[PDB]
């Protein structure tokens, strides 16, 4: 509730330049202040991809599988599907670079049952976590807003959620992204895939930006069928909050 | 405490090379792993300036003083020493630019009795906070050695000061000033004054780098009489850990 939101088409601007299909929602202070590009997208759920480690690793601190801050996260050496991942990891570094087996364990680890119960305590989504307990953020069932995501990372920024305040804080530092005196960056990404045909895939960039006393929740979701559009998932809102005299 | 130190006289390099007296304390992994460029500096107590928003905001949190990390610090429009802290402040912000009156209100508000309760439990230097609450960490009086920066900010990072894990956790949030997918630093300058007649000021530099997996603390301090000389605060300690793969 309480979400007051404003469609502004002319931010579709941005989008209509590079021929692509998706929303931004930008709130200034709180959810009582929105505006988007597109009404009907803004509430329309999408596979959370990446973006879902966000929950994951609130959730693996609350149930104790992840320890602590300082857990290290040990590669056992054998091939994981991207050259980033094939490292030990700090949390930080994990989320960072979008570490899928390192959050896969962790899921498998925390289990269906406690998954369900954390998934239900942050209203995340449509809080269905069926189809294997390791992907069900990457390829089933799991479908969450662009609106929802400000709503949850609101919650987060205020230490509102269902969860200690200092496992919020932890995984709140593991997401700044960009740390000046006076501007300060958390976010997320997430890319489900290509799709298939007439089913693209979902690309994804959440967060908040502190500038001075001033906050900003924004998430941005686009269809994608390509791979080569993905920096777009950056661009396009990093236009439009300059052009509001965010980025800055 | 349980700190191994060694000397390594190579590091005197980047300090000769600029006329500059100082020192720097570098520690892979936990202070049972340290290394500095003078053992006898770097155990030397000076004045922390404003590294001591550190301690403070941490107090600040504990006391109840600061309500929490959304805390606001209005400007009230009576000119400040530097315009930069002519504008409202987060807890971040006003650390990040030293906005040392925010701090002195801060400081006054948690008293003498907690203030000295706390600089006991945080075992923070010389712990004098004599010459009046809003005073002590500037000018003389309370004085810390690199050495003792190095622990404190230690026990910060790992949570184990007598102080609630959320409160450090606010700060050390408050002290990021890079951050990078797997590069994250911590960090906070001061800076005295020029000083006088060869009773020169201080400036500092302490915080922490995470890189992958490794962490390294450090401190560093130098002795200066000219305020042009300041960048070295910095540029220094980013040779000597760039020389050592930082």
Not at 1 to 7: A, P, Q
Not at 30 to 38: E, G, I
Not at 88 to 108: E, N
Request: with cysteine; proline share 3%.
């Amino acid at each position: 509730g309480m979400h007051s939101i404003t469609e502004n088409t002319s931010w579709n601007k941005e989008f209509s330049a590079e021929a692509v299909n998706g929303v931004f929602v930008l709130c200034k202070s709180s959810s009582k202040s929105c505006a988007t590009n597109d009404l009907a997208r803004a509430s329309k759920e999408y596979l959370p991809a990446s973006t879902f480690k966000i929950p994951n690793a609130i959730i693996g601190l609350e149930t104790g599988v992840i320890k602590n801050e300082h857990q290290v996260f040990k590669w056992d050496g054998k091939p994981r599907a991207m050259k980033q991942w094939e490292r030990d990891l700090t949390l930080r570094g994990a989320i960072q670079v979008s570490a899928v087996p390192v959050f896969q364990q962790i899921a498998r680890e925390v289990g269906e049952v406690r998954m369900q119960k954390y998934l239900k305590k942050f209203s995340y989504g449509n809080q269905n976590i069926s189809g294997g307990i390791d992907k069900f953020w990457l390829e089933d069932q799991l479908r969450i807003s662009a609106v929802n995501q400000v709503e949850f990372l609101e919650s987060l920024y205020l230490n509102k959620l269902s969860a200690s305040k200092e496992n919020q804080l932890i995984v709140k530092e593991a997401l700044v992204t960009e740390a000046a005196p006076e501007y300060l960056v958390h976010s997320k990404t997430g890319f489900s895939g290509v799709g298939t045909e007439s089913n693209p895939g979902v690309a994804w960039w959440v967060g908040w930006v502190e500038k001075e006393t001033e906050v900003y929740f924004f998430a941005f979701n686009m269809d994608i069928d390509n791979e080569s559009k993905l920096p777009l998932r950056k661009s396009i809102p990093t236009k439009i909050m300059e052009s509001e005299g965010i980025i800055g």
